Design goal:
The structure is a homodimer. The first copy, chain A, is 0% helix and 54% strand. By secondary structure, chain A is mainly beta. Chain A has a single domain (1-147), classed as Sandwich (Jelly Rolls), CATH 2.60.120.200. In chain A, the strands form two sheets. In chain A, strands 1, 2, 4, 10, 11, 12 and 14 form a seven-stranded antiparallel beta sheet that branches. In chain A, strands 3, 5, 6, 7, 8, 9 and 13 form a seven-stranded antiparallel beta sheet that branches. In chain A, strand 7 (67-74) and strand 8 form a beta hairpin. The first copy, chain A, is globular and about 40 Å long. Strand 9 of chain A pairs antiparallel with strand 8 of chain B. The PDB classes it as sugar binding protein. The entry lists the keywords beta sandwich, carbohydrate binding protein, galectin, sugar binding protein, Structural Genomics. It forms a dimeric assembly.
Chain lengths: 147, 143
Amino acid sequence: ALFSAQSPYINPIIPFTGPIQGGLQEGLQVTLQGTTKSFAQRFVVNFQNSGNDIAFHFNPRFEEGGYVVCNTKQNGQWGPEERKMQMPFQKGMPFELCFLVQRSEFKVMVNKKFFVQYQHRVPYHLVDTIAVSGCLKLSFITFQTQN
Amino acid sequence: AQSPYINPIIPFTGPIQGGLQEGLQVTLQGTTKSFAQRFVVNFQNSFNGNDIAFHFNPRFEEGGYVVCNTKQNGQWGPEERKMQMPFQKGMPFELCFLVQRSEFKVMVNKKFFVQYQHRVPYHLVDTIAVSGCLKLSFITFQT
């Protein structure tokens, strides 16, 4: 059972950028509730420091049959991409998107089902910002702890 | 752990004595063919033949990348692609699979390359299959 870590962001204007109080922490659950636009090609969820360094870049693309890119950006440089070759979102449809911060990875769920993992390439502690952009809208983003 | 296969002839299929278990390292020392398009390391279960628990498949195409996947009931699941090629063609390699509780851990030339979380129980694997553009001097097993 989860408790809120910080007041949520409600109906935030895309492109959105906002602090995560105290930074990412083990057991933090970040939930995004929103709708993929009807003719969406891409969107982006970034966990960054304060766009130059992105610890975790989550980038669904409705291209080439539909797939999702996980990656990290350091000093302006993209690392090797990890692509999960399936599209768990649907243009025009609402979705629930959850990021669980674990010790060794982000676990990602889409609509209450496991979708991908992404092992930390830089520590999650240095993240104090979530940025969201691209072809979607959001009802909310929540922050929840088990503690 | 069990005794090595030595210059196994590719395409190859051999038993893994006792099957997979936690802490097992399976090592492949080999050489990528000079004009290598693709190769395949499959972990399979001889009791449902053509299924593959873990398919590891470097592809020298589109910049070089590696496919990890699973085949069940004759059906491929969603591919996990690492968009990076850690094998140079014509060059030797040390390919290393570490069986862990919740994943395969893959080391290439002594560097961590990828993990692949188990989708079917790892205990089902009693077979290693190697095919495509390479030759192999060894497959070892230790604990």
